Design a protein around this nucleic acid. Sequence first.
DNA 1: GGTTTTTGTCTGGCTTCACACTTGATTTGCATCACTGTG
DNA 2: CACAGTGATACAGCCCTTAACAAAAACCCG
DNA 3: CACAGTGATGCAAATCAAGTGTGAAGCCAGACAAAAACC
DNA 4: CGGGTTTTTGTTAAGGGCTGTATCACTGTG
Lengths: 320, 608
Amino acid sequence: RRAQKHRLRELKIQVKEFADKEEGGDVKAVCLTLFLLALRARNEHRQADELEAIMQGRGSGLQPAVCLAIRVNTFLSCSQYHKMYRTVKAITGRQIFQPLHALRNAEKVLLPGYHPFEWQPPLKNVSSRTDVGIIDGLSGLASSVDEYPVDTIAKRFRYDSALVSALMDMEEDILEGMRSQDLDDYLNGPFTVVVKESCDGMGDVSEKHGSGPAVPEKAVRFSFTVMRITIEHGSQNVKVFEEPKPNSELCCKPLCLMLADESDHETLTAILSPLIAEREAMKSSELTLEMGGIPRTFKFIFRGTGYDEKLVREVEGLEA
Amino acid sequence: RRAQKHRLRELKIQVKEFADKEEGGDVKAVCLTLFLLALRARNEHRQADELEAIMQGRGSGLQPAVCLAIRVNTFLSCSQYHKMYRTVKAITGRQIFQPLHALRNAEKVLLPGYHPFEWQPPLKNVSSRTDVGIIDGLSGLASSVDEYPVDTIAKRFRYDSALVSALMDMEEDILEGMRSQDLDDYLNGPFTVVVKESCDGMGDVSEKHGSGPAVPEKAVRFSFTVMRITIEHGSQNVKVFEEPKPNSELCCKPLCLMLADESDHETLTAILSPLIAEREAMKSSELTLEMGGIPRTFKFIFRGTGYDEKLVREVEGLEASGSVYICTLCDTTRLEASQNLVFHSITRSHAENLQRYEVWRSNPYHESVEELRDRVKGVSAKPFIETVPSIDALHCDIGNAAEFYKIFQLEIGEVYKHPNASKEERKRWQATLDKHLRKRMNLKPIMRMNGNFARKLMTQETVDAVCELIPSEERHEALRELMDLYLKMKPVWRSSCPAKECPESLCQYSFNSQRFAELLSTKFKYRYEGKITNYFHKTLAHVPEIIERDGSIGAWASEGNESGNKLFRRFRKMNARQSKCYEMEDVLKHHWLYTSKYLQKFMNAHNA
DNA sequence: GGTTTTTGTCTGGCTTCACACTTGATTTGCATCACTGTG
DNA sequence: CACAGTGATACAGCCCTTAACAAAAACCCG
DNA sequence: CACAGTGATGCAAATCAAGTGTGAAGCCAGACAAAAACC
DNA sequence: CGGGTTTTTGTTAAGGGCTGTATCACTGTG
Ligand SMILES: [Ca+2]
Ligand SMILES: [Ca+2]
Ligand SMILES: [Zn+2]
């Protein structure tokens, strides 16, 4: 490297002084172009195509989004992925899989708290901030010695931000659906979105050791799916996206996981009150989101169909 | 392509004149150097390495062996690997990975039954064929409706085939160790191989649907691992290998997997008889096997230590498990063991148990039931598996920790002043002990005691948190000193090399044992007058003798077999066919592939 | 209209990739089989 | 002293620019 | 009428290795000649 | 045999950016 730099001590100087004049000072692009022309003069076309793919990250590389998709949908843990990446490094020599920090950087885009959303009218009792991530499910429940004892752990997502992330994960799907029925592409009619929220407790979940309250060995999950999305066109309505597998495990997007008891009622109400408040506030509100270069509005219709009979009774008044 | 030549016309002239006058005339090469310099300055070393690889010899494409190694060690299943390979191919273009059929072809080298071998003394009662794979564990037992009913599903490797597969998987480690010992390389002396047999029966395995016998919901695994390999040189032998993690899940090798009850002696013996026949046949023979192009001979020394207390009682011939004869190494009654607590001797063996069964059956002296049992020292059944006298470290620790838990539960109630207590009092003692244990050291209450619970409860903070609930001070000091004694005792029978990393502890074990025994006999007369646990008996009597006889206690423990049991459920649920007739075979093959070591060095290529 | 950029061509000569036929010889892809797991 | 995870976080290693100087290996010829 | 596995088996589709003479395409030489977006 | 010339490789310190590994309290099969 040092010998090449010392021999090439001037060539960089005049190529950069020309780049400052002809282009602006982008030495990498002009050097790549000159290499491509040199290869063409030497008559290698497949090699030039491969180099172009490499510069575009197609011939190799496996972009971090693709690597994260592989790791997540292959049910591979982070440590196992690191082992596989390290051994592929050592053997092949190139970088076929991306590093864990790159995966984690690409992770933040899909998680809630990255896109900007504005409400009109603003949601009642819901903050207008657009960077809320994983918040405590207790909603700041009083946990001193003087009040009702708390023995639950709950991490939950704000309902509106979670809906924004779920809608943005299917941006291409919504565009394709709107293209399929020969509608426009920049149409910004008010979308009508129906969401099936399902809550069901579990049993025989092993309580762990470690610092925390006397947590019972029961877990209650809250989740929602996006069933269908429609736009208002002309006098009637037309569907854009319909889930082909409504009962699959790939559509039951989680919302709020608390390791509490289903039979216990006070803690259940305390933890699930904020979500119901947000849902009631959003029942009559309009969500604005920058959907692929054109702002479009959203509407929400909620159906609580995914409850078993015992929880339905325990919630909606009925006894036993 | 054409509209970009008129920015480069005014530059290629000086580029090529410089190349002619200084480099020699090459333009593509000098531009390669310039582009590498620019890319490395821009901090695009990934692209720089890709360009270097593509311009140099193309290293694209992984070997089927390394693909299989990744697929097995990264805990992956065939369908997930297939979709990973499909997406990688479809996106990258070139086929970096290798297909499932190629991986399946490449995995026949490691599985037993593909390499040639022979025995210099022809083994008795077993075929010399060298192309046997997974053979039925039932050994062709009669399944006719008229015969004794069968309810077991067993798939099994032949013992010598598994041994030769393991040995020439071990081949390159053996060669590397031989080089590292400053010896020759092509020497072919009588190798001695020491292997460890571990057997344990599990529970709560979910029986599947489908055609098959009335199989129970219990499983028994029979696994072995290679510990030491030695070869003779002049007047001494050299340690050609030594297992670094004898208790890991990467060393125990599955050999015979069956779904049968541990205590169902009928089917247990029915399935394990061929294994003992093979062990007896090959315990007095010699194996000739090529090793890197040069034949080498193998001797075998066989030891059984991976057996739990109940399984030793069942297969060695002791009464049931409780009896009055408590130890599996010495013939001493529970009361006599409770009064002596110090001095004993290891005096049981498989041949002694066989002859004692012969005496019990024939009754050569015309004597009654009680006196005959007294003469036969509790042997009331004929043994069928040879096991050496040893101690299972994990179960010993678990039992000792449970006993200490009960001692704390009693002491927080001061039973020494209240000889009579009620069930409500005992329940309240248990509840307060659990609450304060949680509050102080933060352990949840459990009903079956684990080993992590043992390790966390065997601390000084434990006796601290207990004694802050005991009003008296004499109990405080007694518990503290007993706890210190136990912590000084534990390292000896839990370390891989007791004679290396714990010399002072090993030396002081005897004095600590005497102090512990007399402390119990004096300050704990309310628990240990006329009765003591077999695990305390073992720890206080037999551990130094076993150290002197063997070399280490704990390297032969059942930690590896427990880890294999952990792997068994994962393999059954994600890496095996979900049918009652092929699941066991698939689990056996995948577990053998995982425990293979040729597929493990590939994932440690980063240190090369 | 001026100015600059962007494509187009010119003929002889060079290299570089695809194929024209045939017969095997592999490698690779995907459907089938009776089952599980969370209730 | 069971041993291989399990994932987020933070610090260390390696390497790029500036520019002038220093230690070291290969031929030429008196 | 849940749905994503679970791995071995087996047949069908795809790719290729062997022989040399073609075509078909990209590019090199330095120079001349029309379209198109800002004034 | 050794200056003399030419070429190869490294070195000093201030910053930026990617990459690798140790650390934290825990898990499970018992
Ligand atoms: Ca349920
Ligand atoms: Ca067991
Ligand atoms: Zn004993």
